[PDB]
Amino acid sequence: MEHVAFGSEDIENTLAKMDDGQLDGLAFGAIQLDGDGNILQYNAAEGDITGRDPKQVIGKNFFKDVAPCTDSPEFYGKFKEGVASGNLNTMFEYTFDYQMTPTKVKVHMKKALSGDSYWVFVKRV
């Protein structure tokens, strides 16, 4: 397994070196979106939480297509504020409940070392 801690301070650096295969080796959910909320990477752990087959949701829009409950000032709004600012690093709990058993999760959004990419780390609480 990949030894990366959820919430680590230099995580963006650590995952920068990871391909899709290795990303599935993480101990938590990992999603990489571009500036518009489209899905670039999506590991199996995140699939374990929501029920999405990793390969099937990539290319989809997270907020419009995949996770509509996250479309609110409390999630999507924080994301759109960060992209525009060119800086994002916020952690907060949330309840995943669209087409699934309400699952309470801890969410960590942070700008990736890459140009226009943003990470969404999730773990059960």
Residue 89 within binding range of ligand HC4, rule CB under 6 A: no
Residue 50 within binding range of ligand HC4, rule CB under 6 A: yes
Taking CB atoms within 8 Å and a gap of at least 24, the contacts of 49-58 are 49/96, 49/103, 49/105, 49/122, 49/124, 50/96, 50/100, 51/99, 51/100, 54/24
User: Cβ of 44: how many Cβ atoms within 10 Å?
Assistant: 14
Pairing type for strands 89-96 and 29-34 reads unpaired
Residue 68 within binding range of ligand HC4, rule CB under 6 A: yes
Which span sits near ligand HC4 by CB under 6 A: 5-13, 15-23, 60-68, 76-84? Answer: 60-68
Residue 67 within binding range of ligand HC4, rule CB under 6 A: yes
Shorter beta-carbon distance to ligand HC4: residue 32 or 70: 70
Q: Which residues bind ligand HC4 (CB under 6 A)?
A: 50-52, 66-70, 96, 98-100
